[PDB]
Amino acid sequence: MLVFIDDGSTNIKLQWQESDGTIKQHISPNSFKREWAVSFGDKKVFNYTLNGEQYSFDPISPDTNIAWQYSDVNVVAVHHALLTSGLPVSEVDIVCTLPLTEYYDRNNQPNTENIERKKANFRKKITLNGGDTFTIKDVKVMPESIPAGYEVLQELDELDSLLIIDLGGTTLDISQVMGKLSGISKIYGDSSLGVSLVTSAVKDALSLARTKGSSYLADDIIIHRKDNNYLKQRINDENKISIVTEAMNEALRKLEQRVLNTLNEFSGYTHVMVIGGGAELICDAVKKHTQIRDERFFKTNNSQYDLVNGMYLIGN
């Protein structure tokens, strides 16, 4: 079994193909705490032991990004993603990830130590309380932006170029790739903002415990921000709805504000693709800004999985 895993620090995206040929996609959050969760009978808990420490999954408080890729939690979050993927527990080969400006140097040349360190990380032994864990055998690396735009690039003429805009949890990366992946025109990495900007705006708009715990609430609000029906039910307070909406919009305005300034650094692209968890949040602005024709603008309603699905399709 081969599983493609885009283990981002906000969400882990999984992709693999079944015996019947169907291609599966899964997303598991990076929400864990350094202690087992106790259950007296009604709550199903995931209690892990990674090196010596015990960990457990849970909707904790949202609080390095880079350090995380080689952390014990990363390993736990990945196994957990496997365990909750629906896949049968087994030995598995995986392909994981390390960002555009990390994979490529300043001259857009692919950039050993970090890579072997990444591989070595899944060499850590994990155990699940009252259950069995998958066995990670072989562990390939792919750049982030590119795999998501590949099936479109195949169709592009060598002279046209896809502008890929990825809005992640804590970074916004934009790249411009020549048709038929015949070259990387430009890469712009910006680790100063991501969806977490909006997330924290919501956790504050509603005095919310700044922990991964409330991240599910914050997410529901951001996602259903245009449906007052949903908002009313999720938020039992009428006053807090107008407030969260104002705070949510200023944060959104900041996102759109920046992606737009950055797009002015790119020119000559013929096609546009928006990916990442927050793709939906800046989609309209960039479409408007770039003024690219509908048939050349790419977006999906599963944006957080566009990368790992693209990776899956390439190396399946």
In the complex, what is the shortest distance from the CB of residue 2 to its own copies, in angstroms, rounded to a whole number? 19
Question: Kindly report the CA angle at 289 between 283 and 291, in degrees rounded to 5?
Answer: 95
Contact call for residues 11 and 2 (beta carbons, < 8 A) = no
Q: How far is CA 161 from CA 112, 142, 167, 272, 284, in A?
A: 30, 20, 19, 9, 20
In the complex, what is the shortest distance from the CB of residue 169 to its own copies, in angstroms, rounded to a whole number? 17
Question: Is the CB of 35 or the CB of 284 nearer to its own copies?
Answer: 35
Question: Is the CB of 19 or the CB of 207 nearer to its own copies?
Answer: 207
In the complex, what is the shortest distance from the CB of residue 111 to its own copies, in angstroms, rounded to a whole number? 5
Question: Is the CB of 26 or the CB of 212 nearer to its own copies?
Answer: 212
Residues near its own copies, by CB under 8 A: 33-43, 45, 47, 52-53, 56, 58, 61, 63-64, 67, 71, 100, 102-111, 141-143, 146, 157, 159-160, 181, 183-184, 190, 192-193, 217, 220, 233-234, 236, 250, 253-254, 257-258, 261, 264-265, 268-270
In the complex, what is the shortest distance from the CB of residue 270 to its own copies, in angstroms, rounded to a whole number? 5
The token pair that represents 40 in the structure block: 């007296």
Question: Is the CB of 45 or the CB of 91 nearer to its own copies?
Answer: 45
Question: Is the CB of 92 or the CB of 215 nearer to its own copies?
Answer: 215
In the complex, what is the shortest distance from the CB of residue 82 to its own copies, in angstroms, rounded to a whole number? 21
Q: How far is CA 79 from CA 26, 157, 257, 298, in A?
A: 13, 40, 37, 32
Contact call for residues 104 and 187 (beta carbons, < 8 A) = yes
For the beta carbon of residue 282, count every other beta carbon within 10 angstroms.
23
φ/ψ region of 291 (left if φ > 0, alpha if ψ in -120 to 50, else beta) reads: left
- 239-263 and 195-205 helices, crossing angle to 10°: 160
110 by DSSP, 3-state: which?
strand
Question: Is the CB of 48 or the CB of 87 nearer to its own copies?
Answer: 48
Question: Is the CB of 78 or the CB of 153 nearer to its own copies?
Answer: 153
In the complex, what is the shortest distance from the CB of residue 183 to its own copies, in angstroms, rounded to a whole number? 6
Question: Kindly report the CA angle at 241 between 58 and 251, in degrees rounded to 5?
Answer: 75
291 by DSSP, 3-state: which?
coil
Q: What is the DSSP letter of 70?
A: G
Contact call for residues 28 and 85 (beta carbons, < 8 A) = yes
d(CA 230, CA 239): 15
Question: Is the CB of 21 or the CB of 41 nearer to its own copies?
Answer: 41
The amino acid sitting at 50 is L
First to last CA, the chain: 10
In the complex, what is the shortest distance from the CB of residue 229 to its own copies, in angstroms, rounded to a whole number? 12
In the complex, what is the shortest distance from the CB of residue 231 to its own copies, in angstroms, rounded to a whole number? 11
